[PDB]
Amino acid sequence: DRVALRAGVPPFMDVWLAAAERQRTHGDLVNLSAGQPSAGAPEPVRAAAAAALHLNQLGYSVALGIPELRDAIAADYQRRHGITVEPDAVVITTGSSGGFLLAFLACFDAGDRVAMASPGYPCYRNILSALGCEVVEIPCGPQTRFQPTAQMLAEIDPPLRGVVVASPANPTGTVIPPEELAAIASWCDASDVRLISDEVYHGLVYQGAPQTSCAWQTSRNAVVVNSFSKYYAMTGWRLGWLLVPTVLRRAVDCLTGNFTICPPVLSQIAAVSAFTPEATAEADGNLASYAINRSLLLDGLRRIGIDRLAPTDGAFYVYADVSDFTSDSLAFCSKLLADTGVAIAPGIDFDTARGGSFVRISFAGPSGDIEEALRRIGSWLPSQ
Amino acid sequence: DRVALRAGVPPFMDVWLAAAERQGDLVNLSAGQPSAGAPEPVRAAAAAALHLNQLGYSVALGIPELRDAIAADYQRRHGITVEPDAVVITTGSSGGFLLAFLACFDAGDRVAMASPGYPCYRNILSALGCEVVEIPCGPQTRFQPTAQMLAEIDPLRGVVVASPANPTGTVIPPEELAAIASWCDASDVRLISDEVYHGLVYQGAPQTSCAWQTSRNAVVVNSFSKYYAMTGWRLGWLLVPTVLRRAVDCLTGNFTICPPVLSQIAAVSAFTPEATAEADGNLASYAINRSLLLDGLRRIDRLAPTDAFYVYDVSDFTSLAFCSKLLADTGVAIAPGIDFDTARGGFVRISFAGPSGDIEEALR
Amino acid sequence: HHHHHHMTDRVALRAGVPPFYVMDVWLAAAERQRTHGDLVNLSAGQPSAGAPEPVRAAAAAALHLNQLGYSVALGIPELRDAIAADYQRRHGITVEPDAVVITTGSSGGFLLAFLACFDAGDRVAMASPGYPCYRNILSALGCEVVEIPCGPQTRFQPTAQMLAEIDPPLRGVVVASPANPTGTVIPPEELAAIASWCDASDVRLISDEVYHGLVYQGAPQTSCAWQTSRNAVVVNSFSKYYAMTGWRLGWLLVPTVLRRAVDCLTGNFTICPPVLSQIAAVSAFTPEATAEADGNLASYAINRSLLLDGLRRIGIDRLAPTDGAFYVYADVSDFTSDSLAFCSKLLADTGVAIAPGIDFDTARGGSFVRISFAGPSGDIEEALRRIGSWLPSQ
Amino acid sequence: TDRVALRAGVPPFYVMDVWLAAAERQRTHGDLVNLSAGQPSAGAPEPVRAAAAAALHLNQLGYSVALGIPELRDAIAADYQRRHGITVEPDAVVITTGSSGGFLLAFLACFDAGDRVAMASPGYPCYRNILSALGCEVVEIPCGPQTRFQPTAQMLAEIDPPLRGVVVASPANPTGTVIPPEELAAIASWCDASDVRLISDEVYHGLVYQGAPQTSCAWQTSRNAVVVNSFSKYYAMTGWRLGWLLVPTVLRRAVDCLTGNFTICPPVLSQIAAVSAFTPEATAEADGNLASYAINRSLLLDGLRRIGIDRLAPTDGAFYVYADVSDFTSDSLAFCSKLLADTGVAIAPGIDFDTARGGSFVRISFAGPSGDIEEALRRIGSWLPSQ
Ligand SMILES: *Cc1c(COP(=O)(O)O)cnc(C)c1O
Ligand SMILES: *Cc1c(COP(=O)(O)O)cnc(C)c1O
Ligand SMILES: *Cc1c(COP(=O)(O)O)cnc(C)c1O
Ligand SMILES: *Cc1c(COP(=O)(O)O)cnc(C)c1O
Ligand SMILES: N[C@@H](CCC(=O)O)C(=O)O
Ligand SMILES: O=C(O)CCC(=O)C(=O)O
Ligand SMILES: O=C(O)CCC(=O)C(=O)O
C-alpha cells in the first residue's frame, strides 16, 4: 500500500554486513571498516551496571536524565577543559543519534536550510531530509582541511537557518582549528543561524594535531552534541548528551518526554562511573593503542603508494585518496574483500558527489589487524 | 532566538514531579509503570553479557536471537505464525512509534485516535507534521473506536488504537478490533495497533487479540516495558508489513543505529518459564490490587471497564485542582484526566501497580 | 597365575568419625519431592533467603573491578574494620580490628580455634544436645570430647556449677547461644559466670555466637563472651543472620596470646578466606542489608508464633525455649519410643520433613525432634494441618 | 599460664611475610617490581566471571552437597578424558575449598598422628606445617641438581624407618621442575608395593613449557594415590578458594564424612562459576596467560645468565625460577632484604622452602608483566657487581 515519501531516504551498516559474510564463508576477515571501538565499556562502568541490576528497580528516570550523570558531565567540562557549565544545560539523550533528533526538531521547522560539510557523517543528511529540512552540502577538500570556514558559510545563498559541524569528523578525522570554530560560532550568532556542534569524538585526538574546543567557549547559542559511544566505548549502551541553550530547554524537555520518555536508565546509572580516574585511564589506554595503530597505518600507506590523506587529527579513521588505483571506490572495496578479505569503507557512503575517489580505513582494532592488512594490500594493489 | 514551531508541543510526568516534592506521607497511585523491575533471568543474562560481550552496535533491526524469540512467542502463546523478518527491535515502543509514523505517514496526513488516550501519540504526530484527528469516546461505546465511528469522519490516512489502553484499561473486543482492522484495509487507511499492555489482562472483561489475526497490513507496536517490567531498559518491537520493511530498516539505522544491545541480549531470557512466572506473578498482585480498588471506590462507581493497571471517572466533587489538593492535603497522588483528554478530562486515573498496602491506605 | 594376599588398604582411625547427619536427612527429603512432590521441609539448618542485595551488588561489581587474588591471611582490612565497628555500634563493646580474624565460615574458624587452643588428648566439654560437628572436628583432631547432658532443668545450656563438678579437669569448654538445635540462649549472667569460671580454672572458652542477631521478643538478651572475659575465643559467621551460607565466610575474635598461632595456622591451612565473599561482606553492614536481615527475622517471628501455638494444639507442649536461631526442639516421647522412626514415618506418610534428635544427642535424642521455621509460613501452616491429621492415629 | 597449643607452634607460611615487605616499599618508595608472588597476576576467565554474575541473580547460594555440585564433578571427570585420555568416574572427584582444603582432607583421611610422611626439600612449606600441626612425622628428602630437585623411587626405597606416606609435586613450588612420567610411575608403583600412600600434588598442571618433560597424572599408573589439584593457578581463580581431589574408592567414605563436618561444602558461587572454566573461551584465556609466561620465562632465563646467575632448577612448569645465588651470598634472606631496600625488586628467599639448604637459594616469579621482568633485570645488573 502506502509508503511515506519522506521515509524514502538513503540507508546508513551495509558494508558491515558484507564483512560478516566473509568470516562465515572464508574466515580470513581483517576488519578496518567499523565505525566503533573494538573495546567495550570501562570496568567501573560495567561494575556500576552490575551493582545497579541488584540495587535499582530500573524504572523510568526523569526525562532530562538523572541528576548524578548531569552533575558529572557538567563537572567534566570544568575539570578537563576549564569551561563552566550549569547542570541544567546538560540533557541526557539516547545516544548522540537521539540528541540529533531532539536538536533538529527543537531548532528547525520543515523547509529550513541546514548546511554541513561533504564528506561527512551520512546520517545528518538522512535525519534532516526525513524531518523535512533542506540539506545544503558544502563540498570540502584539502584546501580547507576538509572542514567548513566562516567565509565559506558567508558565501552561501539563499541564507541558512542552521549549520552542522563535526570536529573530529567522520570520515576524515580532521579537527576544526579552535580559531576557525570560534569564527564559525561568531558568524552564526551575527547571521542568526543555529550552530549544531558535533563533539562526539572529543577525547580522541593525536599528538601534533590542532587542539579541540567546545563551541560553548565562544557562543552558548550553539547546540553541543556529544556521546559515550566513542571515547568511553559505550557504543551499544545508547547514551549521550546535549548542551542546550537556555531558550531551547523547554522545547527539548517537551520533545524528549514524548519521543523517548527517558534515556536507558541502566546506561545512565553506569555512566556516572565513566568520570572516575580508573575509567579515564582505560579510555586513554584505548587512545594509546589507536596512536600506535595510526602510526603503523600512515607509514604503511605511504610505502604501498597511498600518500594523499585527510589530516588524521582525531577519531580513528584515515580518509584516503585512492583515485590513482581506481575510478570507482565502491568497486575497489568490494574486490579487496573478495580477494584478500581486508574490509574497508567506500567514500560514496560519506560523499555522493566526490566519494568515488575516496576510502575510509578504521584503526580502532588490534595492531595485528593493521599489520596483516598492510601485508595483504601490498601484495594485491600492484596488480590492479 | 529561534525555536521551531513544531517543537512547541504539549509536555507528556508533570504529576510525577508534584509527588516527588511531597516526599507528607506519599502514597503514589499516579505512576505509568510497574513497581517491579526486570525478571531475574533477564538481569542474569545482562550480568553475564557485561563479562562475555563487547556490547558494540548490533545490526539495525535487532539481534536474530531476540527476533526469533518474539516470533516464536506469537505462536507458542497466541497461535499466530509470524516470520522473524516481520519483527523489528526498537528503542522502546516510543522508538517504535517514531519509526511507524515516519514510515507510514507524510506531513499533513490525517491520523485518528481515541480520546481519552495516551498523550504522546498526539504530540509525536503533531511534531512530525501530521494532522491529529481526536475521536471522543465515552461509556456509551467501548471507550474504543469502531469502524462505523471511523466511517463518519470527514474528510483519514491512519488510525491508532490501543488495547488495553492508557488511561482506561479497556480492551477493544476481538470482533470490534477485527472489524476496525477490516475497515482500514477496505478504506485504504493504515492501522497502528498499540499492543503494549498485552499480557496484563483481568479475569472476564473482553479478551485481547493481535491485529495480525485479521490483517497483516496493520503495524503492531509492543514493548518489554509493561508486561516484562523492563521499563528503563528502553526495548520494544514492531511487527512490520512487508511493504514497509525497507523504509523501517533505513529509518532505524539513521535515527537510532540500533536498540540498546545489553537490553537486547538480556531480553532473550524474558521468554524463559521462570521469567514468565515472575511476570504472571506481578499480574496476580495487580488482580488483588484491582479488586481492592474497585470495591473500595464504590464505597464512586462509574468507571471505564478495567480489562493494564489503571482505573479511569469522578465529576461530583469537581479534576486538575482536585488532584493537586488531595496531594497537598492527604499525600495520595493520582493523575488528572486533562493530561489524557483536553476536552472532557476535567476524570481521574488511578494506578494499582504498587503494593497492596498503598491501595488499602489510599482510601480516605 | 598365583593368587596372593593383598596388603590391607589403610584408612586413618581418626578419619572414622560420624557424618554430619543433618545432611543425610536433607537427602531423604529431596527424594520425596522427586517421587511424590508433596514435600514440606522443616528439616533445614539454613535460611531459605540468600545474601542481601547490597552484598550481591558488591560481589557483582568486584567481578569487574577486582582481580580476586589471594588476600592477606587474616582477611581484608575493610571487612575487619567493619566487624570491629559493628560490635561498638550495635552492642557497645570496643573491639580492636586486630582482634578480628576472617575465616572460611565458622567451620573454618572452629578448625583454627581448636588447633590453636588445644593439643591432642585435651579434654574439651560441650552441651548435649548440641551441634554435632564440634564433637566430630575435635575427635578427628585427637581431642577428648566431654559431653555435658543438659535438659529442661538448666534451659538445655551448661552452667558454671555444672562445669565445676566435672572430673578430671577440662582444658576447654564450647558453648553456643543461641544453640542448634534448641534455639535457647545462655542468659547474660550465666554466660558471664561460665566465662569467669573458665579464667579462674585456666580453661579455654570457645563461644559460638553464630546465631546472634536472630533472637525473639521476651527471650533472654544475647551477649558476647568478650563483655566478661577477653580470654575466650568468639566464633561467628555470615551464614545465618546475613544468610550468606554458601559464601563460606565468618570471623573469630582472637585473644592477644593466640593471634600469632592463628595467623600461622590460617596461612598454611587456608591461605586466605574467599576473597569475593570478603569484598561483598563489607556491604553487609549497610542500613539496607541490615533491614533485609531483620526482615528475614520478622518472617521467622511470625513463623515461630504459628509453630509454637500449633504444636500445643496437636499435643506437643514440652519444648526447649525458642529464644533464637530458627529451631524448635520438641519432646516427642509421649508419641514415640524412637524419634528416628517417627520422622521417617511422617515423611513417608505426610511428606513433612523434620530432623530426628539422634543427630544432636546420641544418648537422649530418641525422645526429641528438631523443627525448622526459616521457610515460608505456608509450609508451617500446611505442615501443622498434616501432622494434626496423622498424629492421633500413631 | 595462658595456654597456647604446642602443635599450633608451627612456622608461618613465610611467602605471605615477603608479600608484606614488598607492600611497604610501594607505600614508602613507590618503585616496587614484584617477582615474589605465588599467584597469577591475571584473574578468573571471563566465562567464569559471567557464570558467577548470573548465579548472583538466579541462585540462592545456599549450602551445596558436601562433595560438591554434580555439574562441576562431571566437568572435571570429563576434562581428564578430553584432554589427557584417562577415564575418571564423577564419584572419584571431590570438590574442596582450594587444594589447601584438599590437603587437610587428604592428610586426615590417609594418616594418623605419628605417621611418617615424606616430601622433597625444597618444596611447598605448607605440607610440612599442615602435617606437623595434624601430629604427623615429617620426613624431609633433600633433593638437588643430581636428581632434578625431585625424589626418585630408589631414594624412597633407601628411607628407614618405613614411611606411611609420600607427597610429590609436579610441577613444584619453588623449582618449577616436573617429575618425568617414567619416574612418577616408578614412584607410584613403589608406593603400592610398599603399602605407602601417595599424595600427588598436580596443582600446576596445564602450566608447562616447551621442551620440558611431559606432565602425567598419578592415576595413569595407580589409583591408590590421592590426586590434589586446584583452580587457583592454571585457571587463575586463586581467591575463589576452589579445588578438587581424585579420591581412591577405599577413602571416599572417610573424605565425605570429614568434609561435611570440617567445611560443610566448598564455596558455592565458586562451584557454579567453575563449570564455565571448561569452555573453549576460558581455556583460550588460560592458555593465553601461559603464552605470556613463556615469553617472560625466556626473558628471565636469558637475562639471569648475562648477570651471572646460571645454576637454576629446570623451569619445566609453574611460574618460578629457583636460582642458586651462593656465589653472591652466604645468606639468601639477607640478599633479598638488601635488594628490596636498594633497588625495590622483590624476590623470595629459599629459606621459606628449605630450612637446611635454602640460604643458597632464591625464588623468582615471572607471572607478572614483561616490563617488570625487564626492569628487574636492569636493576639487578647494576646492583649485583658491587655486592
Ligand atoms: C559513530 C558516530 C555517531 C553515533 O553516535 P551514537 O552516540 O552512537 O548515536 C554519530 N555521529 C558521528 C559523526 C559518528 O561517527
Ligand atoms: C509505556 C507506554 C507505551 C510505550 O512506552 P515504552 O516504555 O517506550 O515502551 C505506549 N503507550 C502507553 C499507553 C504506555 O503506557
Ligand atoms: C550452620 C551452623 C554453623 C556454621 O556454618 P558456617 O557456614 O560454617 O559458618 C555453626 N554452628 C551451628 C550450630 C550451625 O547451625
Ligand atoms: C599455590 C599452591 C597451591 C594453592 O592452593 P590453592 O588452595 O589451590 O590456592 C597448592 N599447592 C601448591 C604446591 C602451591 O604452590
Ligand atoms: N549480636 C551479634 C551481632 C550479629 C552479627 O552482626 O553477626 C554480636 O554480638 O556480634
Ligand atoms: O568526555 C570528554 O573528554 C569530552 C568532553 C568534551 O565535550 C570536550 O572535551 O570538549
Ligand atoms: O597431565 C595429565 O595427564 C593430567 C592433567 C591434570 O591433572 C588435570 O586435568 O588437571
Q: Categorise residue D40: left if φ over 0, alpha if ψ from -120 to 50, beta otherwise.
A: beta
How far, in Å, CA of C295 to CA of C309, rounded? 22
Nearest ligand, CA A215? 6
* C64·B50 Cβ contact <8 A: yes
- Judge whether C9 and D102 are in contact, CB under 8 Å: no
Nearest CA to ligand 7 atom 4: D217
Tell me whether B55 touches chain D (CB under 8 Å).
no
How far, in Å, CA of A239 to CA of A98, rounded? 9
Q: In sequence order, which ranges of chain D are alpha helices (DSSP H)?
A: 14-28, 46-58, 70-84, 98-110, 125-133, 153-157, 181-193, 252-262, 268-274, 280-307, 332-342, 370-383
For B203, counting Cβ atoms within 10 Å of its Cβ (0-12 exposed, 13-18 middle, 19+ buried), the class is: exposed
How far, in Å, CA of B39 to CA of B41, rounded? 6
For D57, name the nearest residue in chain A, comparing CA atoms only. A54
User: Which grid cell is C98?
Assistant: 586486630
Nearest ligand, CA D218? 7
Chain B residues with CB under 8 Å of A8 CB are 247
For the CA of B118, the closest atom of ligand 2 is 13
- Judge whether B227 and B200 are in contact, CB under 8 Å: yes
How far, in Å, CA of C140 to CA of D262, rounded? 10
User: Which grid cell is A67?
Assistant: 541528576
DSSP state of C325: T
How far, in Å, CA of A60 to CA of A78, rounded? 29
> Which residue range is the domain that position B8 belongs to?
1-364
Closest residue by Cα to residue D197 from D231, D124, D248: D248
User: Which grid cell is A259?
Assistant: 519521543
Name A119's Cβ contacts closer than 8 Å, sequence gap at least 6.
Answer: A140, A146, A171, A172, A319, A347, A350, A351, A354, A355, A358
User: Which grid cell is B45?
Assistant: 543474562
Tell me whether B85 touches chain D (CB under 8 Å).
no
Name C9's Cβ contacts closer than 8 Å, sequence gap at least 6.
Answer: D224, D248, D250
Chain C nearest-CA distance from D58, in A, is 11
A308 alpha carbon, distance to own chain's centre: 22
Cα dihedral C8, C10, C15, C18, rounded to 10, equals -20
Strands C368-372 and C355-356: antiparallel
Q: What is the DSSP string of A333-358?
A: HHHHHHHT-EE-EEGGGT-TTTGGGE
For ligand 3, is residue C210 a contact (CB within 6 Å)?
yes
Closest residue by Cα to residue A333 from A373, A274, A276: A373
Say how many CA atoms lie within 13 Å of D23 toward its Cβ. Answer: 9
For ligand 7, is residue D95 a contact (CB within 6 Å)?
no
Residue B116: cis peptide before it, omega within 30 degrees of 0 = yes
Chain A nearest-CA distance from D288, in A, is 16
For the CA of D214, the closest atom of ligand 7 is 1
Nearest CA to ligand 1 atom 1: A35
How far, in Å, CA of D178 to CA of D171, rounded? 4
- Judge whether D171 and D215 are in contact, CB under 8 Å: yes
Closest residue by Cα to residue D204 from D374, D33, D368, D367: D367
For B43, name the nearest residue in chain D, comparing CA atoms only. D57
Residue in the structure block whose three cell numbers are 507534521: B129
For ligand 3, is residue C327 a contact (CB within 6 Å)?
no
Q: From residue C85, give the alpha-carbon distance in Å to each of C91, C288, D282.
A: 10, 17, 40
Of C53, C54, C64, the CB nearest to A50: C64
User: Which grid cell is A201?
Assistant: 569524538
> Ligand 5: which of C226, C228, C236 to mutate, judged by most atoms within 8 Å of the beta carbon?
C236
Which neighbouring-strand residues pair with A139?
A118
Alpha carbon of A227 to ligand 1 centroid (Å) = 7
Alpha carbon of C145 to ligand 3 centroid (Å) = 19
- Judge whether C240 and C208 are in contact, CB under 8 Å: no
Alpha carbon of C282 to ligand 5 centroid (Å) = 14
Which neighbouring-strand residues pair with B171?
none
How far, in Å, CA of A97 to CA of D181, rounded? 63
CATH number, domain of A256, equals 3.40.640.10
DSSP state of D312: B
- Judge whether B351 and B197 are in contact, CB under 8 Å: no
What φ, ψ does residue B45 adopt, rounded to 5°? -65, -40
Ligand 6 shell residues, CB under 6 Å:
A 76, 80-81, 199, 202-203, 214, 226, 231
Best of A258, A262, A350 to mutate (most B CBs within 10 Å, chain B): A258
Best of B35, B63, B255 to mutate (most A CBs within 10 Å, chain A): B255
- Judge whether B24 and B138 are in contact, CB under 8 Å: no
Closest residue by Cα to residue D170 from D128, D202, D208, D210: D202
Chain B 114-153, CB below 8 Å of chain A: which residues?
A: 119-120, 123-124, 127-129
Strands B219-223 and B236-239: antiparallel
Name A24's Cβ contacts closer than 8 Å, sequence gap at least 6.
Answer: none
Of D47, D56, D57, the CB nearest to B52: D47
How far, in Å, CA of D14 to CA of C31, rounded? 48
Q: In sequence order, which ranges of C282-328 are alpha helices (DSSP H)?
A: 287-314
Chain B residues with CB under 8 Å of C64 CB are 50-51
Tell me whether A266 touches chain B (CB under 8 Å).
yes
Residue in the structure block whose three cell numbers are 483536553: B342
Radius of gyration of chain B (CA): 20
Q: Where are the beta strands (DSSP E) in A152-290?
A: 162-166, 194-198, 223-227, 240-243
How far, in Å, CA of D205 to CA of D210, rounded? 14
Chain C residues with CB under 8 Å of D267 CB are 246-248, 274, 277
Nearest CA to ligand 2 atom 4: B93
Cα dihedral D14, D18, D19, D22, rounded to 10, equals 170
Tell me whether B45 touches chain D (CB under 8 Å).
yes
Q: How far apart are the first and last CA of chain C?
A: 61
A35 alpha carbon, distance to own chain's centre: 8
Where b means 16+ CB within 10 Å and e means fewer, A134-147 reads bbbebebeeebbbb
Which neighbouring-strand residues pair with D324?
D361
How far, in Å, CA of A350 to CA of A342, rounded? 20
Strands D33-34 and D226-230: unpaired
SS3 state at D313:
coil
Q: Categorise residue B82: left if φ over 0, alpha if ψ from -120 to 50, beta otherwise.
A: beta
Q: Beta-carbon neighbour count of residue D44 at 10 Å?
A: 31
* B12·A60 Cβ contact <8 A: no
Which neighbouring-strand residues pair with C149?
C128
Rounded to 10 deg, the angle between the D252-262 and D98-110 helix axes is 130
How far, in Å, CA of D69 to CA of D93, rounded? 10
Q: Is the dihedral of CA A117, A122, A127, A132 positive or negative?
A: positive
What φ, ψ does residue C386 adopt, rounded to 5°? -75, -40
Closest residue by Cα to residue B71 from B250, B246, B269, B238: B238
For every residue of D330-376, which 3-state class applies, written as one string? CCHHHHHHHHHHHCCEECEEHHHCCCCCHHHEEEEECCCCHHHHHHH
Name D248's Cβ contacts closer than 8 Å, sequence gap at least 6.
Answer: C9, D223, D224, D225, D226
Closest residue by Cα to residue C214 from C237, C246, C233: C237
- Judge whether D66 and D60 are in contact, CB under 8 Å: no
> Ligand 7: which of D74, D79, D80 to mutate, judged by most atoms within 8 Å of the beta carbon?
D80
Rounded to 10 deg, the angle between the D46-58 and A43-55 helix axes is 20
C265 alpha carbon, distance to own chain's centre: 23
Nearest CA to ligand 6 atom 6: A202
Tell me whether A58 touches chain C (CB under 8 Å).
no
* B48·D56 Cβ contact <8 A: no
- Judge whether A167 and A215 are in contact, CB under 8 Å: no
Where b means 16+ CB within 10 Å and e means fewer, C174-191 reads bbbbbbbbbbbbbbbebb
SS3 state at A205:
strand
For every residue of D273-304, which 3-state class applies, written as one string? HHHHHHCHHHHHHHHHHHHHHHHHHHHHHHHH
How far, in Å, CA of B116 to CA of B138, rounded? 8
SS3 state at C148:
strand
Chain B residues with CB under 8 Å of D55 CB are 44
For ligand 2, is residue B32 a contact (CB within 6 Å)?
yes
Tell me whether C68 touches chain B (CB under 8 Å).
no
Closest residue by Cα to residue C244 from C110, C103, C112, C74: C103
Split into its structural domains, chain B has a count of 1
Residue in the structure block whose three cell numbers are 589439584: D229
Closest residue by Cα to residue A131 from A107, A154, A165: A107
For ligand 1, is residue A347 a contact (CB within 6 Å)?
no
For C60, name the nearest residue in chain B, comparing CA atoms only. B47
Residue in the structure block whose three cell numbers are 507528607: B24
Residue A366: cis peptide before it, omega within 30 degrees of 0 = no
Q: Beta-carbon neighbour count of residue B236 at 10 Å?
A: 26
Nearest CA to ligand 2 atom 13: B166
Chain C nearest-CA distance from A347, in A, is 39
Name D178's Cβ contacts closer than 8 Å, sequence gap at least 6.
Answer: D150, D170, D171, D172, D208, D212, D213, D214, D215, D314, D316, D317
Determination method here?
X-ray
Q: Which amino acid is at C327?
A: Y
Where b means 16+ CB within 10 Å and e means fewer, A243-277 reads bbbeebbebbbbbbbbbbbbbbbbbbbbbbbbbbe
How far, in Å, CA of C177 to CA of C209, rounded? 6
User: Which grid cell is B167?
Assistant: 488511561
How far, in Å, CA of B258 to CA of B249, rounded? 10
Alpha carbon of B226 to ligand 2 centroid (Å) = 8
Chain D residues with CB under 8 Å of C171 CB are 3
* B40·D57 Cβ contact <8 A: yes
SS3 state at C274:
coil
SS3 state at C354:
coil
For every residue of chain B, which 3-state class applies, written as one string? CCCCCCCCCCCCCHHHHHHHHHCCCCEECCCCCCCCCCCHHHHHHHHHHHHHCCCCCCCCCCCHHHHHHHHHHHHHHHCCCCCHHHEEEECHHHHHHHHHHHHHCCCCCEEEEEECCCHHHHHHHHHCCCEEEEEECCCCCCCCCCHHHHHCCCCCCEEEEECCCCCCCCCCCHHHHHHHHHHHHHCCCEEEEECCCCCCCCCCCCCCCCHHHCCCCCEEEEECCCCCCCHHHCCEEEECCHHHHHHHHHHHHHHCCCCCHHHHHHHHHHHCHHHHHHHHHHHHHHHHHHHHHHHHHHCCCCCCCCCCCEECCCCCCCCHHHHHHHHHHCCEECEEHHHCCCCCCCCEEEECCCCHHHHHHHCC
Please tell me the total number of residues recorded for chain B in this structure: 364
SS3 state at A360:
strand
- Judge whether C1 and C119 are in contact, CB under 8 Å: no
How far, in Å, CA of B110 to CA of D78, rounded? 66
- Judge whether C180 and C215 are in contact, CB under 8 Å: no
User: Which grid cell is A307?
Assistant: 600518500
SS3 state at D141:
strand
Residue in the structure block whose three cell numbers are 621459606: D352
SS3 state at C357:
helix
- Judge whether A27 and C37 are in contact, CB under 8 Å: no
DSSP state of C152: G
Alpha carbon of A76 to ligand 6 centroid (Å) = 7
For the CA of B235, the closest atom of ligand 2 is 9
Q: From residue B92, give the alpha-carbon distance in Å to each of A46, B248, B269, D261.
A: 22, 15, 17, 53
Q: How far apart are the first and last CA of chain B?
A: 50
Q: From residue C186, give the alpha-carbon distance in Å to each of C154, C255, C323, D324.
A: 10, 22, 9, 60
User: Which grid cell is A325?
Assistant: 588505483
For B169, counting Cβ atoms within 10 Å of its Cβ (0-12 exposed, 13-18 middle, 19+ buried), the class is: buried
How far, in Å, CA of A270 to CA of B52, rounded? 17
Tell me whether A353 touches chain C (CB under 8 Å).
no
Closest residue by Cα to residue D232 from D223, D240, D224: D240
How far, in Å, CA of C345 to CA of C283, rounded? 44
Q: Beta-carbon neighbour count of residue A155 at 10 Å?
A: 9
Rounded to 10 deg, the angle between the B40-52 and B273-298 helix axes is 140
Tell me whether B44 touches chain D (CB under 8 Å).
yes
Alpha carbon of D49 to ligand 5 centroid (Å) = 31
